[PDB]
Structures are given as structure tokens and as C-alpha cells.
Design a protein around this ligand. Structure first.
Ligand code: FMN
Ligand code: FMN
Lengths: 105, 105
């Protein structure tokens, strides 16, 4: 099952909702992640270039897909097939971002 | 600000998250809508053909936009500029739906 994260659009994109599969994949409970930027999932072997591409896409509110190395709460690495998209209203304002995670280890 | 509703994908698409502006627009608090299908927003003058189009799009996981008559908690009608999209994983599985409202009354 794939994880889902919803973040606010502004102000460094704090998490506002996660589904159950997010906890299955990452080992974090909702309480442990709400209000935080998702970058706590990264760690020392995460590819910096990939991170850069995410950062640039989010700042532009452009959809992006990447395979990124992430880490469970306990420190166990896993490969995340990650897809992020803005949620826009019909005037084009970005209301949120949604990300989908699949553990492809 | 535009409302946002996230639902599960299956069964009857129960609401799992709403943003602040959903409460502004509709008068409902999160605790009174979570776990319900969004159709409680409809009422006597809602156009049945519009509802039917939403029903078929959700069943097929197709994006759709409609201007639909909805009702606030206090019973006041409002025009909801509604857009719905599925959230998919990279294999195409539907993870959730996202709806965006704008009160265009
Ligand atoms: C909706 C959404 C979901 C995200 N999911 C993840 C994720 O699962 N794993 C991850 O490493 N980064 C994820 N990110 C990316 C980070 O939050 C962050 O944007 C990225 O590391 C680049 O920014 P930075 O250089 O400021 O950290 C997500 C971002 C958003 C907006
Ligand atoms: C994510 C999402 C958001 C929705 N938002 C609304 C809404 O704001 N107003 C509305 O009248 N129906 C909304 N709907 C549609 C109803 O939940 C329902 O699908 C529609 O009435 C058709 O199905 P029915 O004939 O079984 O009621 C939403 C559905 C989804 C999945």
C-alpha cells in the first residue's frame, strides 16, 4: 500500500495529514510528523542532487517524481518512489501539496 | 481561500481531512464531517444531473469540475465551484481523492 502525505502550500510545507500506509512505510505515527517538513525522512546517504530537484520543483509548484533514499523512524533505510503534486484551485492558487510514497526497496 | 477535502478511495469515500477554508465555506467543523461522504452538503435544489456526473467520475477515478448547489450547516445555500481528482501511485492505484471548493456565490 502507498503512503500519502498532505502538506500546506506555504511556509516550508508542514505536514497536515498522513494516511495509515505512511506510518507502515516510515515507522512514524501522525503525532510525530504533523507540523514538520518531510525532510526528516532523509539522511546521510540520500542523494543531494535528488533533494535539489525536489526543492526546486516544490518552490515552483511543479509536479515531480523521484526515487529517493529515506529512513524509517528507527534509522532503517528504504527506497521511496515519491510523487509530489500541487493541489490547485480553479484560479491556479496552490492550496496544498500531495505526495505519494511507495517503498520499492 | 479555497476549501480542500481529502477522502479515502474506496467504500463510500469517507472524508479523512479538511482544511480551514472548508469550515469557513461550509460552517461544518472537522469532527462533524470526518468519516462521512461529502453528499451531506447537498440538499433540495441541488441538480441531480450534476450529482450523477460526480458519481460516475468518482466511480471511474476521472477528474471532474462542477458548479454545484450546496448547503451550509445552518442551511444556507451556496454555489460550490468544485473540482475533484484522484491521487494515484506510480502503478496507477487510486490512493485517495482530493476535492477543492470555492464559494462562487
Ligand atoms: C507533499 C510533500 C511530500 C513529501 N514527501 C517526501 C518524502 O516522502 N520523502 C522525502 O525525502 N521528501 C519529501 N518531501 C520533500 C521535502 O519535504 C523537501 O521539500 C525536500 O527535501 C527539498 O527541500 P529542502 O532542500 O528544503 O529539504 C515532500 C514534500 C512535499 C511538499
Ligand atoms: C474528494 C471529494 C470531494 C467532494 N466534495 C463535494 C462537495 O464539496 N460537494 C458535493 O456536493 N459533493 C462533493 N463530493 C461528491 C459526493 O461525495 C458524491 O460523490 C456525489 O454526491 C455523487 O455520489 P452519490 O450519487 O453517491 O451521492 C465530493 C466527493 C469526493 C470524492
Amino acid at each position: 500500500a502507498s503512503g500519502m502525505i498532505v502538506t500546506d502550500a506555504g511556509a516550508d510545507q508542514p505536514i497536515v495529514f498522513v494516511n495509515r500506509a505512511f506510518s507502515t512505510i516510515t515507522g512514524y505515527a501522525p503525532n510525530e510528523v504533523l507540523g514538520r517538513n518531510c525532510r526528516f525522512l532523509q539522511g546521510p546517504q540520500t542523494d543531494a542532487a535528488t533533494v535539489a530537484r525536489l526543492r526546486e520543483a516544490i518552490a515552483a509548484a511543479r509536479p515531480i517524481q523521484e526515487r529517493i533514499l529515506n529512513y524509517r523512524k528507527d534509522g532503517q533505510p528504504f527506497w521511496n518512489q515519491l510523487s509530489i503534486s500541487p493541489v490547485r484551485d480553479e484560479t491556479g492558487n496552490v492550496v496544498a501539496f500531495v505526495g505519494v510514497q511507495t517503498d520499492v526497496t
